[PDB]
């Protein structure tokens, strides 16, 4: 049974996601234009930078996240940003053609697009498998917003200080998710759903690690990192 506290938590995370994820994608008109050997770097860099801002505005609203010091807040958002971007992007992802469809042909991103941003199959293939496996879980929006929150507030992020507090916040969220699945997700969809969602957090750690390797290699050449944004440089490095 969902406590009043637990229904509260879900209500706040849902509203937080609604206030930070525009499914009309109206702001995409502001990005440097897509061009279809690193011709998608400006556009995708801008997409990413915008998406870091949204993911921060979500994080702030996670009940308890604000009780963390500003230095723990920063550690959690730097390590998780690319993972929450990959998560939250499942919403525009479509298995119809293994692409992210943000509203129009211009803003429909496939394998070739990501490779024209400096990435290789070593990232892209596992990224597509992840998106596919996440879609097949068929999460309730309540589950989706809980997983993003659980992702941000992970006590194992290198650099964390008050791990105990991060863990207590995260536990409150994990417990809410486990109880939500039990009370509101009907079988068979719910079979081992919690363990499948935690698996997706492990897939994201390995995606984060490969994304970091190739980002570092892309951004080594000052000519490429000229095309990023200042927020992207600050959050992802150099």
């Amino acid at each position: 049974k969902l406590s009043e506290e637990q229904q509260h938590i879900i209500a706040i995370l849902l509203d937080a996601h609604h206030k930070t994820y525009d499914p009309t994608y109206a702001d995409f008109r502001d990005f440097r234009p897509p061009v279809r050997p690193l011709s998608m770097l400006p556009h995708l860099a801008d997409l990413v930078s915008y998406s870091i801002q949204k993911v921060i505005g979500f994080a702030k609203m996670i009940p308890g996240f604000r009780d963390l010091t500003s230095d723990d807040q920063i550690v959690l958002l730097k390590s998780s940003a690319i993972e929450v971007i990959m998560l939250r992007s499942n919403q525009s992802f479509t298995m119809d053609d293994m692409s992210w469809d943000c509203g129009s042909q211009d803003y429909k991103y496939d394998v070739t697009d990501v490779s024209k941003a400096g990435h290789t199959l070593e990232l892209i293939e596992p990224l597509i498998k992840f998106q596919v496996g996440l879609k097949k879980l068929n999460l309730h929006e309540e589950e989706h917003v809980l997983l993003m929150a659980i992702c941000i507030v992970s006590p194992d992020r290198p650099g964390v200080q008050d791990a105990k507090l991060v863990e207590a916040i995260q536990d409150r969220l994990s417990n809410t998710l486990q109880t939500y699945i039990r009370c509101r997700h009907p079988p068979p969809g719910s079979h081992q759903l919690y363990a499948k969602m935690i698996q997706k957090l492990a897939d994201l750690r390995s995606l984060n690690e490969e994304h970091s390797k190739q980002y570092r290699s892309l951004s080594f050449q000052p000519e490429n990192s000229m095309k990023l944004t200042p927020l992207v440089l600050e959050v992802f490095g150099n």
Binding site: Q53, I56, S70, I74, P230, E234
Partner: peptide, 10 residues
Amino acid sequence: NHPMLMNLLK
């Protein structure tokens, strides 16, 4: 350190 992140965090 992370002034842009710090600022978005209020």
